[PDB]
Symmetry: C3
Subunit: 112 residues, 3 copies
Amino acid sequence: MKLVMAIIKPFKLDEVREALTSLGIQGLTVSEVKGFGRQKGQTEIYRGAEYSVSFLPKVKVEVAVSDDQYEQVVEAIQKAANTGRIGDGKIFVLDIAQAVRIRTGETNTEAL
Amino acid sequence: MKLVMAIIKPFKLDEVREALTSLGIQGLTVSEVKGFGRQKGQTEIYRGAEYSVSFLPKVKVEVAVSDDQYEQVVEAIQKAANTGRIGDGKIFVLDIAQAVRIRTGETNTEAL
Amino acid sequence: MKLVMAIIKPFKLDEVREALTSLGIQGLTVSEVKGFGRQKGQTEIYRGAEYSVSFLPKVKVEVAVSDDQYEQVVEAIQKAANTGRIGDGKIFVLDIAQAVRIRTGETNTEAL
Ligand SMILES: Nc1ncnc2c1ncn2[C@@H]1O[C@H](COP(=O)(O)OP(=O)(O)O)[C@@H](O)[C@H]1O
Ligand SMILES: Nc1ncnc2c1ncn2[C@@H]1O[C@H](COP(=O)(O)OP(=O)(O)O)[C@@H](O)[C@H]1O
Ligand SMILES: Nc1ncnc2c1ncn2[C@@H]1O[C@H](COP(=O)(O)OP(=O)(O)O)[C@@H](O)[C@H]1O
């Protein structure tokens, strides 16, 4: 099991859920985040301090898939979230030790 | 050390913090998220595009516990977050390589 | 590769991004969260239920760095986020199995 964590542009999310659905992935969990990177917001200095005046929204997609699916999931998200412009974002893969589906108690692959 | 990540229904959170407190867990960190799964929101098509018009709020509980507590923490959250209805959510367990408490520099178990 | 996850006080974020920038870290991802711990919000009881009436905002910094940088990143964040008062927060380190930069397909260290 893996937790694929993808930090994408908020407008690429419909296309991302689509690819994932084309792969057979039942569901996912989404978070709103602010991004900092090469592409940065505007700053302002006021009284010896520099304050951020604009922010770069991103969407964090967090999806648990099996060891047989993650590599395909990574590739799918990469292709689905790509624009070719700076700020496209990241995909990180972390290892899931255990998984539980709260409704049924199902574990491992059956929890996803 | 483990990071227990639980994606639950937002109204089951008071009951979840309670169980965790009954286990001796000092604290936790909570995030607001949108869920997608079997239980889905409503959609709308407008001009060759399908837009989501309703969303399913979930709460993400993120709690670091020791290797001697995580299995009990998982079980507690599972029982505390269960309703028996579709959408109860997930619990994922990931491995924590290092931990630091910012205030005191305490590490490992003493950081939690 | 590691995902350094730091749960800090929201006003220590400018100082945190600064240290990270002094270390050569290109970017990071930030989330708004609620904290529960020793330092707690106010509660209220109404009709046989206890409701939370105040909340403790925290900022979650999530930054992927290489195996040669993480220990320095942890230390930097610890020093940059420290106040000496209760509620300073946590830093957790998790292992990243794979990394992809969506724009270019670059992997591993080149993805960060
Ligand atoms: N070290 C990092 N850890 C976690 N997320 C990052 C990191 N660097 C960048 N990001 C995320 O990637 C997004 C894009 O960063 P940017 O460098 O502007 O473009 P690109 O990813 O195309 O190089 C950022 O807004 C940020 O959310
Ligand atoms: N593959 C997944 N990865 C991460 N979170 C998921 C995944 N599948 C479902 N979830 C989360 O679990 C919640 C419940 O999903 P759903 O399938 O509707 O009910 P159940 O979990 O009872 O089967 C979703 O709203 C979503 O937040
Ligand atoms: N077990 C835990 N798992 C994840 N985050 C935690 C945990 N315990 C505390 N935190 C986070 O650390 C913050 C500070 O907790 P608190 O105990 O009040 O102060 P301190 O970290 O200085 O002991 C909390 O608001 C919470 O967000």
